[PDB]
Design a protein around this ligand. Structure first.
Ligand SMILES: Cc1cc2nc3c(=O)[nH]c(=O)nc-3n(C[C@H](O)[C@H](O)[C@H](O)COP(=O)(O)OP(=O)(O)OC[C@H]3O[C@@H](n4cnc5c(N)ncnc54)[C@H](O)[C@@H]3O)c2cc1C
Ligand SMILES: N=C(N)NCCCC(=N)C(=O)O
Length: 381
């Protein structure tokens, strides 16, 4: 009974315009008609705008580390015209043992060194020389990754979206997918003003990927969104922190990193929650501030900014890029966890290749990636 536009035909409908949908759509867009359907009025309102992203490697898991390592080539040397300014800024990471767990510290050093030969093992004095506000009594040693970097997430994100548009793709905000149905050989998505059809449905909906499967009648993966809060605060007068590394506790109880001339802190939490527009909890912010004030001489005045975002995982902690078993044309780009920005170039290129029934590109295979490692089929016996 209500008017709708005539349906729009495409080759791939991408649900979600965050880093997952943008990166996959970027690499698809040279090959066919891409339409990205995004619920919000902007593409980076959810997790992709909430990360203050950092890059490493040295450290998630074999699959995560391989996706991250394979992404660096694009970040450091993206195609001409992709963006105006460098995407990465140097920002070593120092993981400090505040627990007195030398065996764990040595484990993480040996493991990181295997992918990052410049990985170093520091004693407590060396850690305190690098971040001089550390309390020496609280520090037992550290690892140091000289190769870490900060990511200009908004430039990267906007570069992917711009590339889609330059290849005649569409990025449509205020286009929540409300219904999804397999109709005459295509996936057909109803948005509030009209419908969209394509042989391939690319589910890149962040914390909402299982909700999208629910609209489509496709068995979900068991994705678990987890809240992480962060805040920005001023350093004390006389503390010149702008060149400090990313500092993380060995047991991931907190982290602290410069963000320009301010400091970013976080309790590095992972509280399981439903997919929603998540807000910071006061106990998260108070805990992060408490732990920083205990580990360092800093005292924290009232934050300038607080927020939280969702880091969404499947059971094994690995990302998912692959067609659903038994659901023709439904492709998952999911379970980015805490790693969606730093893995986005390899995930985007790999997912687009697999959607198109193509082998993974050599340079990805050389970093120890294969289709099986990415597939949702591994979550089932
Ligand atoms: C505090 C914090 C720190 C982090 N640090 C880092 C870091 O250092 N490095 C790193 O790589 N990552 C980091 N992350 C993780 C990173 O934020 C996520 O992995 C990444 O942003 C996930 O991207 P996404 O595209 O899957 O999700 P999102 O950006 O949330 O995008 C999903 C999109 O789908 C849309 N959508 C949902 N349902 C529908 C629907 N029905 N119709 C249409 N659109 C829909 C949403 O509106 C949203 O825009 C951090 C995250 C947090 C919160
Ligand atoms: N880099 C580490 N070794 N751990 C710090 C995690 C930072 C991060 N990607 C996040 O908050 O999701």
């Amino acid at each position: 009974h209500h008017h709708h536009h005539h349906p729009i035909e495409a080759d791939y409908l991408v649900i979600g315009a965050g880093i997952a949908g943008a990166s996959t759509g970027y690499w698809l867009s040279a090959h066919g008609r891409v339409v990205v359907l995004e619920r919000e009025a902007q593409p980076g309102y959810h997790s992709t705008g909430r990360s203050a992203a950092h890059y490493t490697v040295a450290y998630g898991t074999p699959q995560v580390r391989a996706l991250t390592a394979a992404s660096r080539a694009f970040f450091d040397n993206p195609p001409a015209g992709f963006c105006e300014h460098p995407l990465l800024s140097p920002r070593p990471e120092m993981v400090v043992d505040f627990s007195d767990d030398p065996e764990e510290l040595r484990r993480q050093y040996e493991s990181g060194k295997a992918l990052v030969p410049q990985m170093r093992l520091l004693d407590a004095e060396q850690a305190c020389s690098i971040v001089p506000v550390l309390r020496r009594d609280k520090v037992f040693g550290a690892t140091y990754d000289p190769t870490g970097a900060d990511i200009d997430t908004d430039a990267l994100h906007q570069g992917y979206l711009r590339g889609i548009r330059r290849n005649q793709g569409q990025v449509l905000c205020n286009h929540e997918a409300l219904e999804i149905r397999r109709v005459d050989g295509a996936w057909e998505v109803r948005c509030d003003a009209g419908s969209y059809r394509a042989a391939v449905l690319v589910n890149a909906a962040g914390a909402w990927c299982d909700a999208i499967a629910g609209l489509a009648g496709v068995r979900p993966l068991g994705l678990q969104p987890k809240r992480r809060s962060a805040f920005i605060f001023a350093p004390p007068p006389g503390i010149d922190c702008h060149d400090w590394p990313m500092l993380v506790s060995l047991d991931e109880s907190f982290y602290l990193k410069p963000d320009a001339g301010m400091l970013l802190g976080s309790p590095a939490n992972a509280d399981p929650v439903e997919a929603h527009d998540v807000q910071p909890e006061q106990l998260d912010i108070a805990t992060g501030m408490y732990l920083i004030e205990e580990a360092t001489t800093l005292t924290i005045r009232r934050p300038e900014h607080t927020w939280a975002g969702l880091r969404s995982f499947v059971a094994d902690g690995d990302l998912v890029a692959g067609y659903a078993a038994n659901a023709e044309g439904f492709f998952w780009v999911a379970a980015q966890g805490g790693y969606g920005i730093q893995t986005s170039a390899a995930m985007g290129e790999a997912s687009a290749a697999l959607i198109r029934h193509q082998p993974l590109p050599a340079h990805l295979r050389e970093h120890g990636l294969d289709e099986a490692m990415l597939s949702p089929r591994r979550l089932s016996p």
